[PDB]
Symmetry: D2
């Protein structure tokens, strides 16, 4: 039984507080399913979307959220998942399937893609319309609150770690132990890497140590590049999940020669890439954008096997503005997940 | 018959004019050979050295030159080339052979390497001591003046094009059609790529068209990214050989999604890497530093087969200051090569 | 619009090894995602002969209209078709794929276990009309030469992907073994990819074709041992592509490689060949099967042809002559490719 | 301090029993060191050598052994390790350092290589001459008996696993849980792989399970391809360490589409490669031969961190003939290591 209207956190304009509104519940069309949202992780991208930080703007008005997980309650024609299935609705909400990028295994680069909680309404709501062809597939007995961050934080850093090409037994630095970074530490350990964690607050490094990091460095107390070269001779790879350009520049510093640094974090603007050093050391800098459907299933398998556990605190849908305030202040221990079915 | 003394172009202090001096000729030690220099290409790296543009500084005083080619006239013990061999003395003058990087095929990254015309004296002289294990091997009937740029300009851009991973049938942009860039156009065509050439003067683009470029862009008159995306939907790869940071940023602009841009040019400082675009488009930015001994042989084979031919103008060793002046003001058509033999 | 007849002529095999017969076959209306293509030409692939003879362990449907180098014009569209009436298209081996499995999502739709194969599991281009999945057809330029372009739809895309699968770089040596339908365009793709090319076959006329199409070395394996000759001449191959229909060519393909060489396999004779273990291990030999190409491989392969870098050697035949065509194919008497001129 | 003569296990003719002989101890020449052997692992390659199974024959007479580990007791000129260093002397005893293969990271393919205990005398002796540039470097407090198999069994399967390109979270099959296979199980788990183990005797699969295998298959009782496809849909990769051609054929059977099977085992003869299946499934078959000096250091690091521990039983040098007879009958639990210092 599906209600006619639902509660959803809606933003009207950039930088405005979100407001809980009553929205009509839509019927799914072709390929679509209607998902009853059990939980939805809060990604920093939702904050970038609310604030309009990016040159590519979201739609307005907007229901954010692309870590939404729940149960399929209605299917349109040609749906690829059935009622009762547990699914997640991620950033890569849909792709065309017939372009250069989709056909070659790079559907994350499809120029016709739609983005959940950005170009179409997302999981900050009691129900969400999803394209059944691109949802994450969850086990029926999944813990919705704990699995939610895998739909973006998890798949993103997992794909990012593959993009660094760091091998088992090599060193990777994770810079920014937030929502993305704290699961990045765990994926990297499950991939056989030694892990150095970089942040700017000691409690973030305490989280990394709990989750398996072999080294921790507070960039405000210690220059990361000098410290990691001194300790172990520099990193084979690095993954930048931080929201500050200076972390990107320091990420270059921590690499040994032929290192590869993958970029997830999306602050506005640029960082200075030192040319001489990048050339003489054969540094590779590579942007990495969420993950394909195959990346997503692989990332979920790591969580299903207990190798990756997101650190989660539940919040109510109505408190989303307080969640964004804590996020702006760096006060979140891992991820906040909205418990939408719980209250 | 080897002289005790020789003429050499020597720099004494940064930014100072070079002077032709009489310097001693050394006898080669273990693994070393003494090479009689027939020609030596003038690389912009030589200018960065004499000006001290880089944070890692050269020795001072310094004989520059790492595009030197000539004939072996004396061998130290355990030399790996013989008297009469035609050889080249490149930037990767020597490497340790036993580190992580040398063992895995990346001897260009050896942290114990020595660099010709930078950390050791180079080819701006009548004779040069070389490590016989790292010289380029030339055919006995080589044209020394024409082959000289392959020893750095050639091997560098050839390896750089490999580092872009651009495939046959894909588009590469070459930025800066100078010493490196004008042979990069030719390697790229020989590797099956379509080639877009970018520079800031029309005569550089005329050279590129002459050498096979399919598109040309004067970045001063036309935004490279806008034009190449409009014309062909953007580049699969780019190779930056230019000496200005903005060329690196415009190099990012011209790429399509999943493009890879390889960096050769070595201007001082940094360029602004746009984070959002690099992430959402899966852009790969990769530094590329000369080439291994295997890269160098491959680069020479392309030249020997007539697929790549450097555009060369000779100058006398005493004219090196005039050469650098033309280089600073961008008036060299391809490469200058010092005709040290005659 | 186009006046589509209720029946058409098609070359049909009723049982394995039997001669094909021109039959009056009903013309089908396209369903969802489907289009009806009026066939202008269809290349004859040796796979069509393996299909008619039932050579393979995975059997075709029977009865069967062969042909997966069919090219023509769309004359009818089903619902949700992805090409429109009047478009020039080709109907390849990879007739359709699921689009949502592990292989489809990761760039390997040629490995889709739910794929259908043109002229094998579904009726193909040996007919005046063919039903196609509009999502997987090759896209041709409106002014294409249908007879000349047809082999790119399988011979061309296959060897192009195969050459990529060898990982042979510009300036390196590749050997092409079997200068037939696939091999004679493989020579040209390899040259356009900057490779030096050695051609191997067992009849001098095939090596004459390879030389005329750009091969740098030729060897008749009956005249000269290929491995010894190519190691003597240039020190062995960095890569090899086996397009031959005889297992001994696969064994000799191993011989021609230098250390760290990669040999990609296209040819599909029944049975196996002997892989020498000691040699393969000590030399780090890589043997890699290669199966047609993705939609992206196909567009790339067609781009080489459109630019004049690859030109199939083609002789026209009538649909009614298909049995003589197969006879010539069995005796090794085809100079490159035979293409059925169906429109004329 | 160093004797003029030593005991060594020597084979005089193919298939003959080895005899313990008194042989002179040699002085190390240039680049060479003399190693006092603490232990030496027994590799099936040693048995292939003694029996002359391979078309490339060893030197005769021969001291086998290329898992020898010990202490440097004397250095020739230009030695790269010092007296007192703990080292191992592997299959890749020396390489040229200047060919196509050495320069590109593939020194295991060097056509000028010498092979320890095959083309030069090896570790089945109280002392062994080694090339100081190619020895494995061991920690001073190493357990010599337990580390010895890493010098060939360990580095070989570690490199072989890299050659399969199996990723963390994917399935690899290890075929043959012997000297190589039982450490292959451990490297694969440390590389994040799920592991299926295949052999022809239940005790070999018990060893695999104790060392971390997730699935085991007795190929004599159960078809591996049928079982592994039914259980998990086939393997992303396979590593063949077995000594019988049928294991190679069955290794093909267990792969899913786009699987890669790497070959370590070196039985004489060939195996039947099914052409249709290899093509339609895009199967990659890849030979893999020991590992480079970098591979070797990486493999030792896994052992030093406790992620890989060889299953070892000590034997005396005089027992080598019964060790080979146990090897022929498949009765070795992992590796036998000659305890030479004891
Ligand atoms: N590329 C992708 O596919 C993708 C996907 C999801 C999120 N993101 C982006 O990743 C970024 C992080 O997202 P999140 O949800 O993890 O955010 P978050 O707010 O949970 O955590 C950010 C972390 O960065 C740390 N940090 C700040 N300055 C730092 C510095 N100088 N050095 C090191 N660490 C520093 C903070 O202490 C904090 O731990 C955002 O920009 C988001 O938009 C990208
Ligand atoms: N990485 C390596 O291995 C390596 C090897 C050799 C040289 N280099 C470096 O490469 C650079 C080029 O060397 P060269 O000898 O070819 O120099 P060069 O002086 O011959 O040519 C430089 C070229 O850049 C062009 N250029 C300048 N501003 C430009 C802009 N905004 N956009 C595009 N093109 C622009 C100039 O017109 C000129 O054609 C130097 O920094 C040199 O040190 C690096
Ligand atoms: N893997 C794929 O994707 C794919 C695609 C298309 C075709 N094929 C297969 O490729 C094979 C060839 O097809 P085709 O259409 O080119 O056939 P074809 O009959 O036109 O040519 C076969 C060629 O092999 C030569 N040959 C025969 N014995 C030889 C030997 N011992 N050594 C070297 N060459 C020898 C013949 O002389 C002839 O030139 C067939 O088995 C076909 O089914 C595979
Ligand atoms: N390629 C290399 O670099 C390299 C290095 C070292 C050794 N090797 C070779 O690897 C092989 C094995 O060496 P080892 O020391 O481990 O030998 P081993 O005798 O210790 O082990 C061989 C194992 O194979 C098993 N086996 C036999 N028949 C089998 C079958 N049908 N299926 C599966 N398993 C089967 C046996 O039960 C035994 O467990 C030898 O041929 C040796 O020469 C190669
Ligand atoms: Cl799940
Ligand atoms: Cl030359
Ligand atoms: Cl076309
Ligand atoms: Cl050790
Ligand atoms: Zn997100
Ligand atoms: Zn798309
Ligand atoms: Zn080195
Ligand atoms: Zn230079
Ligand atoms: Zn599929
Ligand atoms: Zn075909
Ligand atoms: Zn061994
Ligand atoms: Zn060598």
């Amino acid at each position: 039984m599906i209600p006619k209207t639902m509660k959803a956190a809606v933003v009207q304009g950039y930088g405005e507080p979100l407001k809980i509104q009553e929205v009509p519940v839509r019927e799914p069309g072709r390929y679509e399913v209607l998902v009853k949202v059990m939980a939805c992780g809060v990604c920093h991208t939702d904050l970038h979307a609310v604030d309009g930080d990016w040159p590519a703007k979201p739609k307005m008005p907007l229901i954010p959220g692309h870590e939404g997980v729940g149960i399929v309650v209605a299917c349109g024609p040609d749906a690829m998942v059935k009622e009762g299935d547990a699914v997640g609705v991620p950033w890569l909400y849909s792709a065309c399937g017939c372009c250069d990028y989709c056909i070659t295994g790079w559907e994350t680069l499809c120029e016709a893609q739609q983005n959940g909680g950005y170009s179409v309404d997302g999981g900050f709501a009691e129900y969400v319309i999803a394209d059944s062809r691109y949802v994450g597939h969850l086990k029926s007995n999944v813990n919705f609150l704990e699995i939610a961050p895998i739909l973006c934080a998890g798949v993103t850093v997992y794909k990012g770690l593959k993009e660094t090409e760091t091998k088992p037994g090599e060193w990777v630095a994770i810079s920014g132990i937030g929502g993305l970074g704290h699961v990045a530490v765990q994926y990297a350990k499950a991939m056989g890497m030694h892990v150095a964690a970089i942040d700017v607050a000691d409690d973030k490094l305490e989280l990394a140590k709990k989750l398996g990091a072999d080294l921790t460095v507070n960039a405000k107390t210690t220059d990361p590049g000098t410290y990691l070269h001194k300790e172990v001779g520099g990193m084979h790879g690095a993954l930048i999940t931080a929201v500050s350009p200076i972390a990107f520049k320091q990420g270059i510093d921590v690499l040994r020669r032929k290192g590869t640094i993958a970029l997830n974090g999306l602050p506005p603007g640029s960082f200075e890439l030192p040319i001489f050093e990048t050339v003489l050391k054969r540094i590779t800098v590579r942007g990495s954008i969420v993950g394909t459907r195959k990346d997503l299933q692989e990332a979920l398998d790591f969580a299903n096997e207990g190798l990756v556990k997101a650190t989660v605190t539940s919040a109510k849908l109505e408190d989303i503005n307080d969640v964004f305030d804590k996020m702006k202040k760096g006060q979140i221990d891992g991820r906040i997940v909205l418990d939408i079915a719980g209250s």
